Amino acid sequence: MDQKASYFINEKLFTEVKPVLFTDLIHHLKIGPSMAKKLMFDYYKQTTNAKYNCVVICCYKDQTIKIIHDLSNIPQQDSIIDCFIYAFNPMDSFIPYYDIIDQKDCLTIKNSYELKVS
Amino acid sequence: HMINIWRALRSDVNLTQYTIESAAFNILHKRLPHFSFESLTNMWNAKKSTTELKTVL
Amino acid sequence: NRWVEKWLRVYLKCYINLILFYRNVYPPQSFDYTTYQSFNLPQFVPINRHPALIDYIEELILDVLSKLTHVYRFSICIINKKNDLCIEKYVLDFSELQHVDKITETEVFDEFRSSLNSLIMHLEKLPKVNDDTITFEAVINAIELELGHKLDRNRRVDSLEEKAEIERDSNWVKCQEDENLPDNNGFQPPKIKLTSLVGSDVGPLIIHQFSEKLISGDDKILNGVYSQYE
Amino acid sequence: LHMDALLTKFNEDRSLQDENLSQPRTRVRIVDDNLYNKSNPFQLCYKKRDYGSQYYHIYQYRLKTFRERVLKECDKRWDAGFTLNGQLVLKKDKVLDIQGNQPCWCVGSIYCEMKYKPNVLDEVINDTYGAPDLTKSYTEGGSDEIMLEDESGRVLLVGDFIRSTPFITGVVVGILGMEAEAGTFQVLDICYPTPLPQNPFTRGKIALVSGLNLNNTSPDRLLRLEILREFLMGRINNKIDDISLIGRLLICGNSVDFDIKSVNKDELMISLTEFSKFLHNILPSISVDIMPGTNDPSDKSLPQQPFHKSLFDKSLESYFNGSNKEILNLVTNPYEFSYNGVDVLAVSGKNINDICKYVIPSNDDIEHRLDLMECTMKWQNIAPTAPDTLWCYPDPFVLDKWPHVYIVANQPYFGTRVVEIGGKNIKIISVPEFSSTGMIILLDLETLEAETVKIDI
Amino acid sequence: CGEELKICSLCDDCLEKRSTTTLSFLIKKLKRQKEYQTLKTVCRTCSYRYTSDAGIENDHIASKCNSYDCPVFYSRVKAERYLRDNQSVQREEALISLNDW
Numbered sequence: 001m002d003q004k005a006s007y008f009i010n011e012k013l014f015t016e017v018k019p020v021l022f023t024d025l026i027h028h029l030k031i032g033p034s035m036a037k038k039l040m041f042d043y044y045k046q047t048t049n050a051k052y053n054c055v056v057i058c059c060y061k062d063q064t065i066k067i068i069h070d071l072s073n074i075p076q077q078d079s080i081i082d083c084f085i086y087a088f089n090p091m092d093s094f095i096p097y098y099d100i101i102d103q104k105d106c107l108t109i110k111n112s113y114e115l116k117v118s
Numbered sequence: 119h120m121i122n123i124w125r126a127l128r129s130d131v132n133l134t135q136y137t138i139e140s141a142a143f144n145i146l147h148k149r150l151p152h153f154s155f156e157s158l159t160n161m162w163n164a165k166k167s168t169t170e171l172k173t174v175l
Numbered sequence: 176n177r178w179v180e181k182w183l184r185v186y187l188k189c190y191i192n193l194i195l196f197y198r199n200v201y202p203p204q205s206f207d208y209t210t211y212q213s214f215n216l217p218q219f220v221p222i223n224r225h226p227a228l229i230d231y232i233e234e235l236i237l238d239v240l241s242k243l244t245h246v247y248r249f250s251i252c253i254i255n256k257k258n259d260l261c262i263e264k265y266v267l268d269f270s271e272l273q274h275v276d277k278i279t280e281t282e283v284f285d286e287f288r289s290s291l292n293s294l295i296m297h298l299e300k301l302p303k304v305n306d307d308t309i310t311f312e313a314v315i316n317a318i319e320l321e322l323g324h325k326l327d328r329n330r331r332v333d334s335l336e337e338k339a340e341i342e343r344d345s346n347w348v349k350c351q352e353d354e355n356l357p358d359n360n361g362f363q364p365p366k367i368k369l370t371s372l373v374g375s376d377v378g379p380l381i382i383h384q385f386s387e388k389l390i391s392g393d394d395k396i397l398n399g400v401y402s403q404y405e
Numbered sequence: 406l407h408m409d410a411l412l413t414k415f416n417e418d419r420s421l422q423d424e425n426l427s428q429p430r431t432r433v434r435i436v437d438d439n440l441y442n443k444s445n446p447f448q449l450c451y452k453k454r455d456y457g458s459q460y461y462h463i464y465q466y467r468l469k470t471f472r473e474r475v476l477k478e479c480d481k482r483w484d485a486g487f488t489l490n491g492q493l494v495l496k497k498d499k500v501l502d503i504q505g506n507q508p509c510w511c512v513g514s515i516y517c518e519m520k521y522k523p524n525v526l527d528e529v530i531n532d533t534y535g536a537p538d539l540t541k542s543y544t545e546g547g548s549d550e551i552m553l554e555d556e557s558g559r560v561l562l563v564g565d566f567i568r569s570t571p572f573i574t575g576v577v578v579g580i581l582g583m584e585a586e587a588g589t590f591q592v593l594d595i596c597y598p599t600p601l602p603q604n605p606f607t608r609g610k611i612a613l614v615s616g617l618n619l620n621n622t623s624p625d626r627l628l629r630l631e632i633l634r635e636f637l638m639g640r641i642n643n644k645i646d647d648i649s650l651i652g653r654l655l656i657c658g659n660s661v662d663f664d665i666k667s668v669n670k671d672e673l674m675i676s677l678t679e680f681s682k683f684l685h686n687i688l689p690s691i692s693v694d695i696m697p698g699t700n701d702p703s704d705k706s707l708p709q710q711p712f713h714k715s716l717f718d719k720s721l722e723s724y725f726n727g728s729n730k731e732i733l734n735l736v737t738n739p740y741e742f743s744y745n746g747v748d749v750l751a752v753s754g755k756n757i758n759d760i761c762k763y764v765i766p767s768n769d770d771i772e773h774r775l776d777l778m779e780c781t782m783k784w785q786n787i788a789p790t791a792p793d794t795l796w797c798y799p800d801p802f803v804l805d806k807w808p809h810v811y812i813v814a815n816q817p818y819f820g821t822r823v824v825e826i827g828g829k830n831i832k833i834i835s836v837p838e839f840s841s842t843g844m845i846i847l848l849d850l851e852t853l854e855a856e857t858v859k860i861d862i
Numbered sequence: 863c864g865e866e867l868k869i870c871s872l873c874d875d876c877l878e879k880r881s882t883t884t885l886s887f888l889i890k891k892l893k894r895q896k897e898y899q900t901l902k903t904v905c906r907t908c909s910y911r912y913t914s915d916a917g918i919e920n921d922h923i924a925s926k927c928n929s930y931d932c933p934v935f936y937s938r939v940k941a942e943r944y945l946r947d948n949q950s951v952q953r954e955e956a957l958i959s960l961n962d963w
């Protein structure tokens with residue numbers, strides 16, 4: 001899986017200036033969220049050029065999703081149940097843009113009700 | 119001594135309607151709703167709600 | 176010529192607003208992050224709420240677009256209020272612009288978003304600018320046109336379009352390249368800094384972008400305009 | 406610990422399991438028994454429309470129904486032959502016939518001042534082009550005491566029992582007590598309309614989000630909405646089993662916030678296209694139910710019709726074919742969602758904001774809002790302030806069956822409470838807005854428990 | 863001939879433009895309804911001087927007012943005429959036709 005997701009992230013981060021999310025990799029390589037998070041963790045290292053501002057969220061025990069802004073004093077250190085890089089930001093401002101994504105087979109949870117046309 | 123107060127207001131202030139509601143709004147800066155006499159006679163009838171009697175009083 | 180002009184006007188408006196906001200030309204409090212400015216902006220470009228400034232920006236964009244055929248380079252000049260020295264020059268290079276009288280909105284807006292994002296990335300890294308000590312100007316580079324000579328016929332206007340044309344014709348003065356830059360005193364001469372940025376490359380619109388920075392001086396230049404160290 | 410330490414503690418030891426994505430786990434099947442049942446009491450026909458009149462008729466109907474209900478309840482409780490501590494209670498009919506030192510009970514409407522808030526007066530004055538001095542017309546401290554009326558007379562009500570209870574004009578209660586020294590009636594015991602029958606009660610959970618307030622100015626709301634969409638798909642928490650228990654998603658209204666006084670169709674279209682993009686990105690993962698809001702482009706009257714078949718992107722044509730409504734259904738503002746055999750009542754919240762905007766000098770906190778909800782449930786009506794909430798009809802707001810769960814949107818505070826009125830258990834949930842303090846509520850149908858998930862930035 | 867100002871055109875609309883036409887109709891209807899509600903609230907507050915009540919049976923008294931020296935009454939009459947006009951019926955019919963898909 002390596003050398004492809006890394007290349008896609010590099011292109012989407014530098015060839016065209018646009019923040020990348022893990023959902024983009026779910027749409028691209030049709031892989032699970034855990035694999036995408038592992039890919040972000042792998043890409044966070046072995047990078048000498050710190051041209052991006054990583055965005056990391058915190059999943060608390062009470063499902064209190066919080067975006068880390070200070071990166072110095074995160075309250076309730078022991079209450080965090082999950083931590084991963086939400087997105088890579090080439091600048092301070094995030095302002096993400098959302099469009100139509102054809103999620104044909106990238107779903108991890110599928111509703112019991114199907115879609116019928118005509 | 120009896121005075122036609124609307125006539126006195128006409129002589130004193132130069133209004134355009136000389137109506138009690140209009141005169142009140144123009145001088146005392148108070149707006150007073152005006153109801154038709156049919157509304158008054160329908161609200162003053164017996165077996166009506168206390169709100170209507172309070173309104174007319 | 177219908178959809179292209181609208182997209183170019185939107186891009187120019189976003190460019191001017193971002194340049195004014197990020198360079199502290201006008202107070203950030205007046206600027207507000209918004210998407211609708213009577214047109215569908217590509218992103219949440221901060222647009223100032225000053226009616227006079229809005230009218231001035233709209234008139235400037237319309238005047239630039241009116242002579243876009245003979246204009247191959249549009250630049251925004253940043254000059255110090257105290258002394259007439261150009262400290263920053265941002266250029267919107269219109270190399271070809273694919274001028275055709277004959278691409279949808281998603282691709283053009285995606286290219287505009289990428290260009291504006293690159294511009295923002297360039298702008299945040301720049302040092303802060305002091306308040307009420309900076310001004311902005313508009314300098315365009317043309318190939319074949321003469322401005323200000325249309326009033327020699329004593330023409331009397333009869334419609335709004337002709338009045339607007341005669342106003343735009345006399346609203347520009349002739350200048351020279353590298354005019355507001357320092358005159359190369361020779362005692363540690365300033366060396367301008369060139370930075371390249373990606374530009375929109377849609378099928379109907381081809382745009383290149385780059386910026387200029389003094390990044391040097393020989394005293395009395397960039398003094399009390401960069402908020403000291405930071 | 407530093408950010409890098411937490412990252413290498415958590416993300417490095419990723420399970421990387423139960424994420425095959427080839428055979429995704431099926432979401433909990435939650436059905437709406439009222440989706441095809443129709444016969445919606447709050448459904449109105451636009452052809453009939455509103456004639457700007459016919460309000461006293463509905464007032465008389467509501468008064469007669471409430472009087473009949475309270476009289477039946479009083480007969481059931483204060484039957485003939487019942488004697489109080491002082492003496493036998495007399496079933497007086499007219500409120501002016503209580504002349505003596507003897508316990509008695511009577512039925513009548515409650516009268517109060519209910520002064521307007523100064524901010525509401527300032528807002529309405531500036532948007533009338535000739536509005537008089539409303540504060541001057543208001544002018545005295547008003548009425549600090551609760552008075553009763555039954556179309557025959559008005560008497561003063563005193564006592565600590567009625568003092569510690571909010572009241573809105575238009576409702577009827579059964580006042581019991583003894584005549585005071587002056588022309589006032591003491592309050593000892595109170596009566597309410599008889600309780601309505603209630604339908605009988607590993608199931609699943611329903612996520613409630615309200616007050617999205619999508620616009621073209623605030624970008625943080627879009628980020629929070631995207632975070633919510635990612636979390637609802639199990640991408641954030643990664644707990645597939647826990648996330649899959651959310652069978653349906655219910656949007657309670659206020660999807661888009663705009664000022665109708667000065668607004669163009671382009672910005673509203675942009676906001677609606679963004680909402681449609683979110684719906685298309687979340688509809689395959691989970692079913693979404695759309696409800697009208699106060700500031701949304703819908704009827705200002707409380708019985709708001711569904712949004713429209715239009716106003717959404719062309720990618721929703723498959724979802725709007727008409728045959729597939731179980732995963733994307735638009736309902737009226739008041740509705741009874743029979744989720745897996747559990748009937749729940751959800752409203753945008755315009756009624757509560759209507760009573761809140763009034764100043765009652767006889768009774769804005771979470772406890773006060775919950776007490777207001779309790780009074781609304783006890784009065785057996787949804788909108789005590791009829792002129793402020795609804796305008797005419799083409800009365801559905803008079804309750805005919807008590808819902809299991811009460812849902813109200815667009816509230817500054819979130820609170821949950823279980824109550825027991827007339828031997829029936831009703832749960833009241835006040836979901837807060839998502840634009841500010843964007844927390845959502847997960848209602849578990851199996852244990853009737855509500856949990857909150859907070860999203861920051 | 864025509865709900866909108868296509869020079870000429872059933873629904874009296876040549877170009878469908880459903881997503882824009884229904885949005886414009888909703889905006890106009892919402893503006894008119896909000897203006898009418900504000901006028902009714904102002905009239906109710908004014909009639910509270912006599913009624914001394916902010917609940918039901920006071921809005922009826924407020925609407926019973928027909929004073930010709932107050933612009934609020936004229937504005938309310940104009941709003942009622944606009945709501946009851948044939949144009950409003952035409953807009954509702956066009957909305958129903960466009961939503962019939």
Ligand code: SF4
Pocket residue numbers: 149150151152904905906908909924927928929932933934935
């Ligand atoms: S019309 Fe003018 S006067 Fe009559 S009620 Fe409305 S406001 Fe008061």
